Ligand SMILES: CC(=O)SCCNC(=O)CCNC(=O)[C@H](O)C(C)(C)COP(=O)(O)OP(=O)(O)OC[C@H]1O[C@@H](n2cnc3c(N)ncnc32)[C@H](O)[C@@H]1OP(=O)(O)O
């Protein structure tokens with residue numbers, strides 16, 4: 001059938017950005033409280049993620065279309081850990097492609113990538129996002145703090 | 158650093174290195190006593206003959222420290238069709254807990270994913286460490302025969 005290919009996004013052209021935005025909007029539908037409203041919010045955040053961590057921008061593809069992506073930052077400073085750590089800035093899969101193990105593949109790819117650089121991985125997830133938190137805990141992430149509607153999770157080597 | 162590559166030839170050097178890894182991971186095959194290496198040798202040769210194109214090794218320098226045997230042509234009567242299979246997967250104890258297994262499994266899934274939508278494997282009933290790792294990669298327990306548990310990873314449409 002169709003292969004789920006995980007690869008580093010080589011470049012963020014208007015075309016790729018458009019696809020990422022569609023995936024983002026699709027995946028965050030219903031979770032606007034955390035994903036923001038409108039394609040503009042998505043466009044700006046994705047561009048920021050690319051500028052900050054293009055080296056760890058992985059996309060899941062089925063054919064010629066991107067169906068999900070994860071942004072891994074090997075150079076993130078955490079005031080909580082008081083040092084440079086790994087971070088996941090974004091992680092989303094097209095709604096139509098969710099529940100098929102694609103997110104799992106992206107997360108494993110992320111852990112393998114960051115594992116070469118950091119002994120700690122930090123992330124923030126919405127407090128109502130029990131689904132994402134369940135996935136993270138299954139991979140060793142633990143809740144360690146909060147900030148408003150956001151929960152901080154960490155994984156140590 | 159760790160390097161993952163397809164084994165191109167099962168020569169004397171590679172074979173003895175593979176036996177060393179196998180013996181380490183399976184704590185010496187003490188039931189066989191002085192013939193332990195002979196049993197490991199014959200099994201490795203069998204794996205190589207049956208699935209050489211999916212025989213990957215992890216190397217630290219010029220020495221093999223781990224390996225995985227991926228079979229893209231395994232008939233499973235349980236699934237009632239040809240599926241992908243993992244015959245063996247082991248990392249030298251001195252090199253375990255460093256992400257080598259994860260790298261080998263990612264390589265395995267990438268390889269088999271080009272041919273099969275289903276991957277089957279059998280693991281010891283008390284091998285909680287391996288089962289945990291397989292479950293993180295999407296494998297699910299689906300059966301048992303004697304002291305062996307059958308696990309399957311099936312990609313959904
Ligand atoms: C740093 C952050 O970016 S936090 C923000 C994370 N992103 C989002 O919330 C955006 C919206 N959600 C998504 O895009 C996706 O649901 C993701 C990325 C969270 C998960 O990816 P998916 O491809 O849907 O999941 P995948 O099919 O690989 O399976 C994920 C596993 O995690 C868990 N999981 C995922 N979603 C849920 C859920 N809604 N409820 C319960 N468990 C869940 C399960 O253990 C599941 O395994 P299973 O199928 O064996 O039960």
Ligand SMILES: CC(=O)SCCNC(=O)CCNC(=O)[C@H](O)C(C)(C)COP(=O)(O)OP(=O)(O)OC[C@H]1O[C@@H](n2cnc3c(N)ncnc32)[C@H](O)[C@@H]1OP(=O)(O)O
Pocket residue numbers: 139140182183243244245246247248249252253254255256257258259260278279280281284286287289290
């Ligand atoms: C089809 C079959 O072949 S079944 C036979 C499977 N093989 C065997 O039983 C042989 C003996 N075992 C081995 O050789 C190895 O332990 C393997 C191949 C199972 C795993 O390889 P490894 O290189 O050790 O594991 P790797 O380092 O990639 O990651 C393993 C994960 O397992 C657990 N683990 C491994 N070491 C530790 C540790 N020191 N502390 C805590 N958990 C650990 C964790 O869940 C670890 O977490 P992470 O993923 O968050 O880092």
